[PDB]
Amino acid sequence: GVFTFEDEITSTVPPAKLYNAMKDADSITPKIIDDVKSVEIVEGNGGPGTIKKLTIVEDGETKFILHKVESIDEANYAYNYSVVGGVALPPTAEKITFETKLVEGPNGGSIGKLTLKYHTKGDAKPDEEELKKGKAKGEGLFRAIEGYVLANPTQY
Ligand SMILES: Oc1cc(O)c2c(c1)O[C@H](c1ccc(O)c(O)c1)[C@H](O)C2
């Protein structure tokens, strides 16, 4: 089946600035997030269909995660990707998609609309553990990119 979850987060950063920064996430996330060590493009031009390999060290163990870029809509401040291999993908799941969309806040800040879609193989049940881990990932990225912009005011 498909399980869909929707969430919102807020930032004082205007959406156009945040979105520019999101485009540099491969560069930014290893600096801010302790566990991420590198992000490498296995193949692709960074657009839809690109495959990325993330190298992380978790619990003193090196591991890898695979991402695939689904779609990009700059006019709409959206970036979509799916987890398609690695530890992040549970055995039951076909695929886990994270959609990120940025909207102007009422006060000029930003609202991040985060949608998580969990595709399960057959009738398998989604792991609660993964979802909990899942909601954090959607947030952490956003915070990572936000923190970086706030800490480097002149750059964006
Ligand atoms: O705290 C974490 C832990 C993780 O395993 C990850 C986190 C944050 O965010 C990473 C991340 C997510 C999206 C990206 O585009 C990216 O470059 C890096 C990834 O989800 C894997």
- For every residue of 72-130, DSSP letters joined together read EEGGGTEEEEEEEEETTS-SSEEEEEEEEEEEE-TTS-EEEEEEEEEEESTTPPPPHHH
Report residue 69 CA to chain centroid gap: 10
63: Cβ below 6 Å to ligand 1?
no
- Give residue 109's Cα distance to chain centre: 20
In the chain the first and final C-alpha atoms are separated, in Å, by 40
For residue 135, give the 3-state DSSP assignment. helix
Cα 88 from Cα 98, distance rounded (Å) = 12
Q: Residue 59: left if φ>0, alpha if ψ -120 to 50, beta else—which one? A: left
Contact 62, 86 (CB under 8 A): no
The SS3 assignment for 154 reads coil
Could you tell me if residue 26 is left (phi over 0), alpha (psi between -120 and 50 degrees) or otherwise beta? alpha
Residue with CA at minimum distance from ligand 1 atom 18: 29
Angle at CA 54, nearest 5°, toward 94 and 63? Answer: 80
CATH code, domain with 14 = 3.30.530.20
3-state secondary structure of 13: coil
DSSP class of 49: T
In the chain, count of helices (H) and strands (E)? 3, 7
Please indicate the experimental technique that yielded this structure: X-ray
Q: How many CA atoms lie within 13 A of 104 on its CB side?
A: 4
Please write down the long-range contacts of 33-40, taking CB distance under 8 Å and 24 or more positions apart. 33/140, 33/144, 37/62
Which residues are within 8 A (CB) of 78 and not within 5 positions of it... i.e. 6 or more apart? 71, 72, 99, 100, 101, 102
Task: Identify the domain containing residue 105 by its residue range.
Answer: 1-156
How many domains are contained in the chain? Answer: 1
Residue 100 pairs in a beta bridge with: 79, 114
Q: How close is the Cα of 104 to the center of ligand 1, in Å?
A: 24
* Cβ neighbours for 104, distance < 8 A, ≥ 6 positions apart: 14, 15, 110, 111
* Whether residue 137 has its Cβ less than 6 Å from ligand 1: yes
Ligand 1 atom closest to residue 98's alpha carbon, by position in its atom list? 13
* Resolution at which this structure was determined, Å: 2.5
**Partners of residue 114 on adjacent β-strands:** 7, 100
Q: Ligand 1: which of 19, 28, 29, 53 to mutate, most ligand atoms within 8 Å of CB?
A: 29
Is residue 69 classed as helix, strand or coil in its secondary structure? strand
Q: Which residues pair with 110 in a beta bridge?
A: 11, 104
140 lines ligand 1 (CB under 6 A): yes
